[PDB]
Every structure is written in structure tokens, then in C-alpha cells.
Amino acid sequence: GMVTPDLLFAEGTAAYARGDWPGVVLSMERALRSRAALRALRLRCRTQCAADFPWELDPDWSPSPAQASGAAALRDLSFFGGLLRRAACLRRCLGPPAAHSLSEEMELEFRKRSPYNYLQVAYFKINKLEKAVAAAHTFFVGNPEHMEMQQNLDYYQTMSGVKEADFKDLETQPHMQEFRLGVRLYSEEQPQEAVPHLEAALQEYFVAYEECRALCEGPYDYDGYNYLEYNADLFQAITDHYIQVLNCKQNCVTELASHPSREKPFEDFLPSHYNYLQFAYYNIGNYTQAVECAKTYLLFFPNDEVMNQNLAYYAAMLGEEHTRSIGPRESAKEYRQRSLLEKELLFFAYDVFGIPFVDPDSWTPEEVIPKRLQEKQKSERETAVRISQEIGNLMKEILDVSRLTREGGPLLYEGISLTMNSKLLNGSQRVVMDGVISDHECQELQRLTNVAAYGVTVFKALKLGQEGKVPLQSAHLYYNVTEKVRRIMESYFRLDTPLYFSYSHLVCRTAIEEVQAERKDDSHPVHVDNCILNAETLVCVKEPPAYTFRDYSAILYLNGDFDGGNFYFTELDAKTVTAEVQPQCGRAVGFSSGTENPHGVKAVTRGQRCAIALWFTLDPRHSERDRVQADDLVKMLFSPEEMDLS
Amino acid sequence: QYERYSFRSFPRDELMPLESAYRHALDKYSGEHWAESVGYLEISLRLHRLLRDSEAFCHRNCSAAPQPEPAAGLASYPELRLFGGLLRRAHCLKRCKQGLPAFRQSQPSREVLADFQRREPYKFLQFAYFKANNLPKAIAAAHTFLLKHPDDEMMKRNMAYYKSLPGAEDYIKDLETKSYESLFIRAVRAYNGENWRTSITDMELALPDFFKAFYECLAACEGSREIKDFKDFYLSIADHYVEVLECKIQCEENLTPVIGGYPVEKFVATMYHYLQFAYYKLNDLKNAAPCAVSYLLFDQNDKVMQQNLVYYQYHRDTWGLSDEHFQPRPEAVQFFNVTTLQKELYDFAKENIMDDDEGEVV
Ligand SMILES: *[C@@H]1O[C@H](CO)[C@@H](O[C@@H]2O[C@H](CO)[C@@H](O)[C@H](O)[C@H]2NC(C)=O)[C@H](O)[C@H]1NC(C)=O
Ligand SMILES: *[C@@H]1O[C@H](CO)[C@@H](O[C@@H]2O[C@H](CO)[C@@H](O)[C@H](O)[C@H]2NC(C)=O)[C@H](O)[C@H]1NC(C)=O
Ligand SMILES: *[C@@H]1O[C@H](CO)[C@@H](O[C@@H]2O[C@H](CO)[C@@H](O)[C@H](O)[C@H]2NC(C)=O)[C@H](O)[C@H]1NC(C)=O
Ligand SMILES: *[C@@H]1O[C@H](CO)[C@@H](O[C@@H]2O[C@H](CO)[C@@H](O)[C@H](O)[C@H]2NC(C)=O)[C@H](O)[C@H]1NC(C)=O
Ligand SMILES: [Fe+3]
Structure with a gap:
């Protein structure tokens, strides 16, 4: 009765642990139907309320001067009155909001369709072979990396009552299945049955798209614990929330075309639809529909040669008046207009507020992008092609290829000496370089961390420096040194894609000599930053409760007098030691955070050990939301401006 | 204490964060020192007024702006127009808030502003003024605090005591006055x-x-x-x-x-x-x-x-x-x-x- 799904999932899991198959099938079916009903109810309410009270717009006004503030007040009040009415109706419609809040873990286990595995096991337990093979097939389609269930449905097919047509999916959306069936069955060069299916595969898409647009208005996504010190004004809250909502809306066109069987999303979905449609239409002989489809494709990429030839050939063969008569499909035009306006707004936001965004479509005209972004993109392409030419020349000069090409860099800054390379350190993608900074810088960093303190981020250090508790020069030096280490480590590994931060904090370890009695356990078990290692299983997992976007990692030490607490690299078995690095002053160790490099830290002895750790990702979607704030703060404090108050 | 105040030109020697000055003033007040507390309290009040006026000037520059003329197609989509205009307003406000000097120091916490709106420092200021032989100023501070809060008890007794003192019958003025x-x-x-x-x-x-x-x-x-x-x-x-x-x-x-x-x-x-x-x-x-x-x-x-x-x-x-x-x-x-x-x-x-x-x- 509209009960929370995770409770039913837990009850079913407990019953399965006991082994009561009727209980588990009942619980799992109830949970799945509950989720479906909840989604349908939310969609219906949220799409009816916004249509009952249309958004109003009456901007016709020209203010007489000094009669200016009142117009702003009136406009703001009218807009917020409309908003309040919409919110009142939506709240009166929806109902009790407690049930809709669920954590991530059940979301992932719903994505993996493990309940379907539970259903197949239970249905086999109670001789329900049809539903059992249905569940097996849908789990296989969802995740095709389990040979055991392949044997399972093979053995299911061994005993009678099973048909090829019985293999029906229960989770994949209709439009994707229709499109795949149409393309596959057109691949046999049979044109007739090709036209209807694709046409159907067209319509559903648009409808499907609409529903996604109505399921994006979700709760804000705070950066973990950053809501304790959130100090945003009202007009900042609106902008941030709406920018996130618009980003999540525009992210949908790269999700509606991603099928779990394929490892990468399809490219240019709607234009490919139109191209296949026009080819099939010409083969069938519906000539006007063919010229229509060609024309509506030409609205997307206006500079394609082969289809220009095709349209010219159609127009020469056909009477020119008919070619003039028909224009492009209206729905595609409307979709393009909406998407283009949204992209323009999002790119303006990226230019000004420094909130990142990546275009999911390849058909945007280059007139909607500001100038600075164009210059940055040109520079990025230039450096990428330069790196490609350099690596090509280096390969021409020729694990050895990896050992000689993927690392070995320029070391642009002076005073840097390659101390330990990959060949000596017994492995791949490991670098140990010395003399990143002098002793003075280490001393100021140590003073900064001693004055106030395990959680001092660069942003926090700069804020405290602005307040006056900690000297400012130390914070400025911290920011400059972190940028410097980013640059050098990125340039050493010959990385074409630009590099972005993910986290950067200073820390200090203080030995407690009174709790070291019989403390034979390691300070931290050997692990990997990318995945979670299950020790004896000897297999990793890209499991979201462990960050999956961190790619490169770096650490730099500051002090040069203690004992214990070394750093070492350990093989996958978590027993043998491959290499170790002796801590000193100005030592930097860098490695890829992949599963091939498990690192380990020994326990510390008498003294204090302080160092900085850094993690870099390659995906521009995952960058800190405080780095831009820190950049703005440093621009505030050390790049002053002036404007006439008179 | 509002005599040497000018929004156009503010001396840079007394540009400290509000909380730091306020905390210093209270710590000195508890330490029985008087002149330093008086000076620091005046500094804090001036800084608060400067911050308020800076906020006012920032918010008058942005909202009172001409509305740009959009494209013909964009007029068919209301929500995008509305939120685009609001985004432009927010960007302009953020750009213009990196200006005026008073906004380039530490932002006070909510409770400090809440108590300052409640005009509480004037009590400590009047006690300090009494401890330094500035009777008209003390009378003005007491009356200024009484105007916002008319139901208190000890302030009434203090004001009656001051009125009993001879001569103090004409310096009754509101320090936080307005033009209108x-x-x-x-x-x-x-x-x-x-x-x-x-x-x-x-x-x-x-x-x-x-x-x-x-x-x-x-x-x-x-x-x-x-x-x-x-x-x-x-x-x-x-x-x-x-x-x-x-x-x-x-x-x-x-x-x-x-x-x-x-x-x-x-x-x-x-x-x-x-x-x-x-x-x-x-x-x-x-x-x-x-x-x-x-x-x-x-x-x-x-x-x-x-x-x-x-x-x-x-x-x-x-x-x-x-x-x-x-x-x-x-x-x-x-x-x-x-x-x-x-x-x-x-x-x-x-x-x-x-x-x-x-x-x-x-
Ligand atoms: C508030 O503004 C509205 C529209 O700008 C105006 O309302 C008109 O008020 C007069 C009398 O003041 C009435 O005769 C009209 O019928 C009102 N029109 C509408 C559309 O309400 C007026 O400027 C203000 N409202 C009032 C009641 O004065
Ligand atoms: C091209 O295919 C359509 C698909 O049914 C044929 O039928 C047309 O269907 C559309 C759908 O609204 C409408 O235009 C008419 O109902 C149908 N007739 C025409 C002339 O469009 C259509 O006949 C086919 N054209 C040719 C030349 O075979
Ligand atoms: C880190 O910050 C800057 C960025 O390189 C370093 O240089 C400062 O910035 C200006 C701009 O070119 C330089 O000309 C000056 O040498 C620096 N500014 C000042 C006011 O001297 C800066 O030196 C680095 N930080 C430290 C502590 O050296
Ligand atoms: C509002 O703030 C803007 C932001 O600086 C200022 O606009 C200036 O307007 C004058 C003439 O009106 C121009 O000469 C300046 O170039 C403008 N500054 C810019 C564009 O940065 C000004 O302070 C305010 N505008 C007004 C009062 O019209
Ligand atoms: Fe680590």
C-alpha cells in the first residue's frame, strides 16, 4: 500500500536468507510494482500541475525615471505569486513526501536488476519456468557478464515448454527495442517492414523524452557536508538550483540512447533515425516522404555533401515544384529550438559562474558559444595535436612501449631532477621526483598547519588567512605550490586531455607513544583509490560508494626528520613489497590510481609527519565546486579593482 | 560618532573585519579599559553603517536596469525568458559586489548582524561613556537604545538617574537618525x-x-x-x-x-x-x-x-x-x-x- 520499497527489499532478502520462496517472490513483486506506481504517480502529478497553471509573461513596460524601483518590486511580486500558486497546487496534489527519499544503494541494486535474479531463483524453486526464463533473460540483457546464467537458461531450454519468442524483456524501454529491431531487420535488405517500425520508434522517442523532462526536478545536490557553511542569497539559490536542473535536463539526450549491451552511447540519434528513414523511404518508392526526410536532416548539419547530392538527385528526378512544396518535420524544428536555447543559457552560465558543462550533442552551431570558450577550445585542440605529433615522432624514433612512451616528460620547471623512474621502481606509472620546493616553503607550510588544524583545504586556508588567524603569504604559497605540482605532474605523463582536480587537503600525523603497546596491526591496510579491493578475492569492483572518477594521484612530503611511517607499493596479493620510498624534504611521488598500483603506508613512530595529498580526474564533469571560489577569492585579495564612487 | 563618516571616502586605517573589532571591544570592556573600548565600538558602528550603505548602493545599480530586447522565437518560451533575465541580474550583482572596499573583508555571521539590528552595543557604549565623563553622549546612547526597546527595566532606571543629574535636560538626541x-x-x-x-x-x-x-x-x-x-x-x-x-x-x-x-x-x-x-x-x-x-x-x-x-x-x-x-x-x-x-x-x-x-x- 504505497510502502517504502527498501523495507520490502530487506524483508525479501531476509526471507531468502531463511529460504522461503513464496515469501521472496511476493516481496519482490510487491516492491517492483510499488516502484512503478510511485514513478507513475509522481510523473502524472508533476506534469498536470505545471499545465494547470501556465507560466505567465507580460513584459510590456517602459519605466519613467525615478519610477524605477517600484517596477522591479511589482515584477518580482507577480513572478513569485505565480511560483507560490504552482507550489501550493503541487504540494496539495503529491501528498506525504517521506516515502520518496531513498539512498543510493537501493538505486544501484535496482539498476543491476538483482531482484530479477531473486525472482528467477524463486520461480525455479516453485516450478514457474516461464517467468524464470523471463527473469534470466532480462538479467542477462541488463548485465551480459555472467556465464553461469547463460548455462542457466540453456538448461531451462533443455526441458520442454520453452520457445524462442518467450524471450521477452521486461525492463528495457520500448523506443530503444523498436529502433534496434528496425535496424536489425532492415540490415537484411528488406525495405517494406522497415518503414513502420522506425516510424513508431520515432513517435515514442518524443513522448519518452517528455517524461524525462518531467522527472529532473529533484532535490539539490550538496557537496557532502558543505550545507553547514552554505551562505547563499535567494537569487543565488535560484540560479544554482535552476542551473543544476537545466544541466540534468540536458544530460538526458545522452542517456536515452545508452543501452547496457553496448559499452558506449549511440551517436547522433535523431539524424541517424532520419537518414535510415529516408533511405528506406526511397527504396520503397515514397518519394515525397523521402525528400521530406532528407530536408529535415539537412536542417541539422547544413554542410553534408553526400546528402546534398542525394537531395539534388531527388530534385532533378522529381518536379521542382513538389521539391519546394514540402518542408522539414515541425516536431524536429521545435525540439531543435528548445535545445539550442537551453544550450545558449548553459554556456553563458559556464562562461560567467565557472560551473562546468560538456555538450552532449555534435550538431550545435558555433555561434552560440562565447569568445573565451572558443579560444580555450582552440588552445586545447592545439596542445592535443602537438602531443599527438610528439608521441608519433617518438614512436618513429623507436611493456617497453608503455615504459618509454606513456611516461618520461619535459620537467618544465627548473631544479627538478628525475630521481626514481618507472624502470627502477619495479612497475608501471610510478614517478619519484625531488626538489619540488625549497626548505623555506616547507617551513611556512608546517607553521600554517601548526597554527590551526586533517581537514585544512586550500579554500579553508585562504578563508582563515583572510580572517587573520593565519598569515596570508602561507596560504598564497600553498595555492601556488598546488598549481605548480598539478602542472608538472600532468606534463610529465604526456596527457593530451586537460587535467582537473578532485580533492586537495593538507594533513599532519602525530604519533601517540602511549597507545603503541602491542599495536602490531598496520596503520592502513593496502588498498586502491579507484576501486575497493576485497583482499583474498583478488578482484576489484567499480562500486559507486568508492569514487570511480579519480585517475591520477600525487603526494608530496615536507618534513625530513622522523622515524617510521614509510610509503611502499604492494602487489595485488597484499603480502609482498615491491618498492619503498624513504621520506625526506621536497620529495614527490606520483602514480596512476588504477588497480595496477596498490599503495601502503606503515605506522608512524616518535615525531610529526606532515604532507600534502592530491587527486586528479580527467572527466570535466567531476571538478570541485570550491576551486572556482578559491580562484575568485585570490583574485579578490591580490588583484584589486577600482570603480568611481562619485 | 557619525561625524567623520563618508561613503565616498573611507580611511583605510580602520578597515578590519566586523567580528574582530567587536570581539576586541568586548574583551577590552571586560578588562576595565575605557578609551580603547570607546574607539573600537565607534569603529565597529561605522563599519556596520558602511556595509549597509554598500549593500544599498549595490542593489540600486542592478535591478534598475533596462530589459534587453530578445529574439522573436525566444518570446514563445516564458520560463526561459524569466530565468534568463534573473540569471543576468544575478551575474551583474555578483560582478558589482567585487567592487566597494567594505565587501572585500570577512563576512559577519548571522547572529552578529541579528544583534546589531537589535542595537545592543549601545548599552556597552553608554556604560563606557559614563566611565569617561561624556554625559551628553551617554544620555544620547541610553535614549537611542530605549527608543527601539521601550519595555525594559534597568534602562529605565538608568535614564531616570541621568535625568536626575543636573544639566542633562536638552542633549536627548537620537544617534541613529534619518533624514525623513x-x-x-x-x-x-x-x-x-x-x-x-x-x-x-x-x-x-x-x-x-x-x-x-x-x-x-x-x-x-x-x-x-x-x-x-x-x-x-x-x-x-x-x-x-x-x-x-x-x-x-x-x-x-x-x-x-x-x-x-x-x-x-x-x-x-x-x-x-x-x-x-x-x-x-x-x-x-x-x-x-x-x-x-x-x-x-x-x-x-x-x-x-x-x-x-x-x-x-x-x-x-x-x-x-x-x-x-x-x-x-x-x-x-x-x-x-x-x-x-x-x-x-x-x-x-x-x-x-x-x-x-x-x-x-x-
Ligand atoms: C495596482 O496596479 C494595477 C495595474 O498596474 C492597477 O489596478 C487598477 O486600479 C484601478 C483603480 O486604482 C482600477 O480602476 C483598475 O480596474 C485596476 N486594474 C486592474 C487590472 O486591476 C492599479 O495601478 C493598482 N491597483 C489599484 C487597486 O489601484
Ligand atoms: C507514403 O506513405 C504514407 C503512409 O501511410 C501513405 O499514406 C499517407 O499517409 C499519410 C499519413 O497522414 C497521409 O498523407 C495520407 O493519409 C496518406 N496519403 C498520402 C497521399 O499522403 C502515402 O500514400 C505514401 N505515398 C506514396 C506516394 O505512396
Ligand atoms: C604564487 O602566486 C603568484 C603566481 O605566480 C606568484 O607571483 C606573484 O604574481 C605576480 C603576477 O605575475 C608576480 O609578478 C609576482 O612575483 C607575485 N606577486 C607579488 C605581489 O609579488 C607568487 O610569487 C607565488 N607565491 C609566492 C609566495 O611566491
Ligand atoms: C551601474 O554599475 C555599472 C557597472 O560598472 C556601471 O555602468 C557604467 O556606466 C557608465 C556610464 O553610465 C559607463 O561609462 C561605464 O563603462 C559602465 N561600467 C561598466 C559597463 O562596467 C555604473 O556604475 C552603473 N551604471 C549606471 C549608473 O548607469
Ligand atoms: Fe591513498
Whole structure:
């Protein structure tokens, strides 16, 4: 009765642990139907309320001067009155909001369709072979990396009552299945049955798209614990929330075309639809529909040669008046207009507020992008092609290829000496370089961390420096040194894609000599930053409760007098030691955070050990939301401006 | 302590964060030192006033901007137009807030601003003034704190003690004064002296100043909030605006000037009443009619004004007036519309939006 799904999932899991198959099938079916009903109810309410009270717009006004503030007040009040009415109706419609809040873990286990595995096991337990093979097939389609269930449905097919047509999916959306069936069955060069299916595969898409647009208005996504010190004004809250909502809306066109069987999303979905449609239409002989489809494709990429030839050939063969008569499909035009306006707004936001965004479509005209972004993109392409030419020349000069090409860099800054390379350190993608900074810088960093303190981020250090508790020069030096280490480590590994931060904090370890009695356990078990290692299983997992976007990692030490607490690299078995690095002053160790490099830290002895750790990702979607704030703060404090108050 | 103050030019020697100066002042006050505490308290008050005026100047520059003309197609999509305009406003405000010096130091926490609005430092300031032989200043500080809070007990005893002291009978002044209240007092004094032209001039000067101050106080009222729950888009912003609307509707009565300890009611109505009486006494109906129309708009029931409005209507052109002299002034229309709309929005909101899960403790 509209009960929370995770409770039913837990009850079913407990019953399965006991082994009561009727209980588990009942619980799992109830949970799945509950989720479906909840989604349908939310969609219906949220799409009816916004249509009952249309958004109003009456901007016709020209203010007489000094009669200016009142117009702003009136406009703001009218807009917020409309908003309040919409919110009142939506709240009166929806109902009790407690049930809709669920954590991530059940979301992932719903994505993996493990309940379907539970259903197949239970249905086999109670001789329900049809539903059992249905569940097996849908789990296989969802995740095709389990040979055991392949044997399972093979053995299911061994005993009678099973048909090829019985293999029906229960989770994949209709439009994707229709499109795949149409393309596959057109691949046999049979044109007739090709036209209807694709046409159907067209319509559903648009409808499907609409529903996604109505399921994006979700709760804000705070950066973990950053809501304790959130100090945003009202007009900042609106902008941030709406920018996130618009980003999540525009992210949908790269999700509606991603099928779990394929490892990468399809490219240019709607234009490919139109191209296949026009080819099939010409083969069938519906000539006007063919010229229509060609024309509506030409609205997307206006500079394609082969289809220009095709349209010219159609127009020469056909009477020119008919070619003039028909224009492009209206729905595609409307979709393009909406998407283009949204992209323009999002790119303006990226230019000004420094909130990142990546275009999911390849058909945007280059007139909607500001100038600075164009210059940055040109520079990025230039450096990428330069790196490609350099690596090509280096390969021409020729694990050895990896050992000689993927690392070995320029070391642009002076005073840097390659101390330990990959060949000596017994492995791949490991670098140990010395003399990143002098002793003075280490001393100021140590003073900064001693004055106030395990959680001092660069942003926090700069804020405290602005307040006056900690000297400012130390914070400025911290920011400059972190940028410097980013640059050098990125340039050493010959990385074409630009590099972005993910986290950067200073820390200090203080030995407690009174709790070291019989403390034979390691300070931290050997692990990997990318995945979670299950020790004896000897297999990793890209499991979201462990960050999956961190790619490169770096650490730099500051002090040069203690004992214990070394750093070492350990093989996958978590027993043998491959290499170790002796801590000193100005030592930097860098490695890829992949599963091939498990690192380990020994326990510390008498003294204090302080160092900085850094993690870099390659995906521009995952960058800190405080780095831009820190950049703005440093621009505030050390790049002053002036404007006439008179 | 407001003598050496200038928004255009502020000396850089005393540009410290507000909390640091306030904490130093309290620590010195507990340490029995007097002169240093006096200086630091004056510094803190000046800094607070500078911050408030900087916020006002920043929020006057941005909202009062021409609306750009959009493309023809974009006019078919309302929500995008609205939020794009709002985004442009936010970007302009953020760019213009990296300007004025007062915004380049530490931001005070919410509680410091809350207590400063409550005018609490004036108590410590008056005690310090007493400990340094500055009796008129102490009297002024005591009266200034008493004006905002008239129900206290120890401050009344202190004020009675000061009044008992000889000589302290004329330095009773409000330190945190405004222009419009002084202009209103002068205008009323002139009116009771049966002088007309001076009253008209001063009162007309007073009107737009009060309108500007009220609009600024409305604008700078959209403060921050502490996040305490997660909701959907529409609800989780509607609650924020409900709180801001409460703090907004608690704004008109604060700006009301007080005389004799009894705040006056219907301030704008009193303004227009005095203006109309003076204009009638000067026999210039051409200006008299709009004032009567506006006051009758502000108060729908008054026999006296219905009577003389009828008498005005009986002479359609005897004084030589046209139909452009029976409609309200634009400014009064703006004020009345803003007030009524805010009242109605709060009334509508306090029936459906906020959850009813708290009750009176029995
Ligand atoms: C091209 O295919 C359509 C698909 O049914 C044929 O039928 C047309 O269907 C559309 C759908 O609204 C409408 O235009 C008419 O109902 C149908 N007739 C025409 C002339 O469009 C259509 O006949 C086919 N054209 C040719 C030349 O075979
Ligand atoms: C880190 O910050 C800056 C960035 O390189 C370093 O240089 C400062 O910035 C200006 C701009 O070119 C330089 O010309 C000056 O040498 C520096 N500024 C000043 C005011 O001297 C800066 O030196 C680095 N930080 C430290 C502590 O050296
Ligand atoms: C509002 O703030 C803007 C932001 O600087 C200022 O606009 C300036 O306007 C003058 C003439 O009106 C121009 O000469 C300047 O170039 C403008 N500054 C810019 C564009 O940065 C100004 O302070 C305010 N504008 C007004 C009062 O019209
Ligand atoms: C508030 O503004 C509205 C529109 O800007 C105006 O409302 C008109 O008020 C007059 C009398 O004041 C009425 O005769 C009209 O019928 C009203 N029109 C509408 C559309 O409501 C007016 O400027 C302000 N409202 C009032 C009641 O004065
Ligand atoms: Fe680590």
C-alpha cells in the first residue's frame, strides 16, 4: 500500500536468507510494482500541475525615471505569486513526501536488476519456468557478464515448454527495442517492414523524452557536508538550483540512447533515425516522404555533401515544384529550438559562474558559444595535436612501449631532477621526483598547519588567512605550490586531455607513544583509490560508494626528520613489497590510481609527519565546486579593482 | 560618532573585519579599559553603517536596469525568458559586489548582524561613556537604545538617574537618525506655526526620501537562511520565499518615526493629509485634488473627506481643473499596490504551504 520499497527489499532478502520462496517472490513483486506506481504517480502529478497553471509573461513596460524601483518590486511580486500558486497546487496534489527519499544503494541494486535474479531463483524453486526464463533473460540483457546464467537458461531450454519468442524483456524501454529491431531487420535488405517500425520508434522517442523532462526536478545536490557553511542569497539559490536542473535536463539526450549491451552511447540519434528513414523511404518508392526526410536532416548539419547530392538527385528526378512544396518535420524544428536555447543559457552560465558543462550533442552551431570558450577550445585542440605529433615522432624514433612512451616528460620547471623512474621502481606509472620546493616553503607550510588544524583545504586556508588567524603569504604559497605540482605532474605523463582536480587537503600525523603497546596491526591496510579491493578475492569492483572518477594521484612530503611511517607499493596479493620510498624534504611521488598500483603506508613512530595529498580526474564533469571560489577569492585579495564612487 | 563618516571616502586605517573589532571591544570592556573600548565600538558602528550603505548602493545599480530586447522565437518560451533575465541580474550583482572596499573583508555571521539590528552595543557604549565623563553622549546612547526597546527595566532606571543629574535636560538626541524623520518634524513644527509654503517644500522633499529608504529596506531584506531539509525544486524554494516574505512584511512598521514615545499610524496617510490641508489653505486646487484622492484611496471611510471631495466635485471648472486631476499620484499607487500584494501573498501562503506540526505548549 504505497510502502517504502527498501523495507520490502530487506524483508525479501531476509526471507531468502531463511529460504522461503513464496515469501521472496511476493516481496519482490510487491516492491517492483510499488516502484512503478510511485514513478507513475509522481510523473502524472508533476506534469498536470505545471499545465494547470501556465507560466505567465507580460513584459510590456517602459519605466519613467525615478519610477524605477517600484517596477522591479511589482515584477518580482507577480513572478513569485505565480511560483507560490504552482507550489501550493503541487504540494496539495503529491501528498506525504517521506516515502520518496531513498539512498543510493537501493538505486544501484535496482539498476543491476538483482531482484530479477531473486525472482528467477524463486520461480525455479516453485516450478514457474516461464517467468524464470523471463527473469534470466532480462538479467542477462541488463548485465551480459555472467556465464553461469547463460548455462542457466540453456538448461531451462533443455526441458520442454520453452520457445524462442518467450524471450521477452521486461525492463528495457520500448523506443530503444523498436529502433534496434528496425535496424536489425532492415540490415537484411528488406525495405517494406522497415518503414513502420522506425516510424513508431520515432513517435515514442518524443513522448519518452517528455517524461524525462518531467522527472529532473529533484532535490539539490550538496557537496557532502558543505550545507553547514552554505551562505547563499535567494537569487543565488535560484540560479544554482535552476542551473543544476537545466544541466540534468540536458544530460538526458545522452542517456536515452545508452543501452547496457553496448559499452558506449549511440551517436547522433535523431539524424541517424532520419537518414535510415529516408533511405528506406526511397527504396520503397515514397518519394515525397523521402525528400521530406532528407530536408529535415539537412536542417541539422547544413554542410553534408553526400546528402546534398542525394537531395539534388531527388530534385532533378522529381518536379521542382513538389521539391519546394514540402518542408522539414515541425516536431524536429521545435525540439531543435528548445535545445539550442537551453544550450545558449548553459554556456553563458559556464562562461560567467565557472560551473562546468560538456555538450552532449555534435550538431550545435558555433555561434552560440562565447569568445573565451572558443579560444580555450582552440588552445586545447592545439596542445592535443602537438602531443599527438610528439608521441608519433617518438614512436618513429623507436611493456617497453608503455615504459618509454606513456611516461618520461619535459620537467618544465627548473631544479627538478628525475630521481626514481618507472624502470627502477619495479612497475608501471610510478614517478619519484625531488626538489619540488625549497626548505623555506616547507617551513611556512608546517607553521600554517601548526597554527590551526586533517581537514585544512586550500579554500579553508585562504578563508582563515583572510580572517587573520593565519598569515596570508602561507596560504598564497600553498595555492601556488598546488598549481605548480598539478602542472608538472600532468606534463610529465604526456596527457593530451586537460587535467582537473578532485580533492586537495593538507594533513599532519602525530604519533601517540602511549597507545603503541602491542599495536602490531598496520596503520592502513593496502588498498586502491579507484576501486575497493576485497583482499583474498583478488578482484576489484567499480562500486559507486568508492569514487570511480579519480585517475591520477600525487603526494608530496615536507618534513625530513622522523622515524617510521614509510610509503611502499604492494602487489595485488597484499603480502609482498615491491618498492619503498624513504621520506625526506621536497620529495614527490606520483602514480596512476588504477588497480595496477596498490599503495601502503606503515605506522608512524616518535615525531610529526606532515604532507600534502592530491587527486586528479580527467572527466570535466567531476571538478570541485570550491576551486572556482578559491580562484575568485585570490583574485579578490591580490588583484584589486577600482570603480568611481562619485 | 557619525561625524567623520563618508561613503565616498573611507580611511583605510580602520578597515578590519566586523567580528574582530567587536570581539576586541568586548574583551577590552571586560578588562576595565575605557578609551580603547570607546574607539573600537565607534569603529565597529561605522563599519556596520558602511556595509549597509554598500549593500544599498549595490542593489540600486542592478535591478534598475533596462530589459534587453530578445529574439522573436525566444518570446514563445516564458520560463526561459524569466530565468534568463534573473540569471543576468544575478551575474551583474555578483560582478558589482567585487567592487566597494567594505565587501572585500570577512563576512559577519548571522547572529552578529541579528544583534546589531537589535542595537545592543549601545548599552556597552553608554556604560563606557559614563566611565569617561561624556554625559551628553551617554544620555544620547541610553535614549537611542530605549527608543527601539521601550519595555525594559534597568534602562529605565538608568535614564531616570541621568535625568536626575543636573544639566542633562536638552542633549536627548537620537544617534541613529534619518533624514525623513527630521524633515517631518520640521514640517510639522512649521505647520503648527501657521506657515504654509515652508511646510509644502519640506514635506515634498521628505516624501521621495522615505519612499527610497523603504524600497531599499525591502530590497536588502532578502537575507540568507540555514539549510534544514531537502525537498523538490518548487517546494524547497517556496519555503525560502515564505520566510523572506515574513521578514519583508515585518518592515513597514520598523521605518515609522516615533515622537513622544507613541509611534504614529498610517504615516503616508498623515503626510498626504498635511499636504492636502496646506494646499487647500493656499487655494491651489490643481495640487490639492491628487492629495485628497490618494488619502481617500488609503482610507476608504472618512465622512469629512467624502464631504469636501463632493464639494470639490460640485465645481467642475470653477477653479479651472481638468480630468487629469482626479487620479492618484503614481508613487502612492506603487506603495499601496506593493503593500496590498505582500499582505495577500502572505495570507494565501499561510494556509497551504507551511506544515502544521507545531502547536502551543500546554
Ligand atoms: C507514403 O506513405 C504514407 C503512409 O501511410 C501513405 O499514406 C499517407 O499517409 C499519410 C499519413 O497522414 C497521409 O498523407 C495520407 O493519409 C496518406 N496519403 C498520402 C497521399 O499522403 C502515402 O500514400 C505514401 N505515398 C506514396 C506516394 O505512396
Ligand atoms: C604564487 O602566486 C603568484 C603566481 O605566480 C606568484 O607571483 C606573484 O604574481 C605576480 C603576477 O605575475 C608576480 O609578478 C609576482 O612575483 C607575485 N606577486 C607579488 C605581489 O609579488 C607568487 O610569487 C607565488 N607565491 C609566492 C609566495 O611566491
Ligand atoms: C551601474 O554599475 C555599472 C557597472 O560598472 C556601471 O555602468 C557604467 O556606466 C557608465 C556610464 O553610465 C559607463 O561609462 C561605464 O563603462 C559602465 N561600467 C561598466 C559597463 O562596467 C555604473 O556604475 C552603473 N551604471 C549606471 C549608473 O548607469
Ligand atoms: C495596482 O496596479 C494595477 C495595474 O498596474 C492597477 O489596478 C487598477 O486600479 C484601478 C483603480 O486604482 C482600477 O480602476 C483598475 O480596474 C485596476 N486594474 C486592474 C487590472 O486591476 C492599479 O495601478 C493598482 N491597483 C489599484 C487597486 O489601484
Ligand atoms: Fe591513498
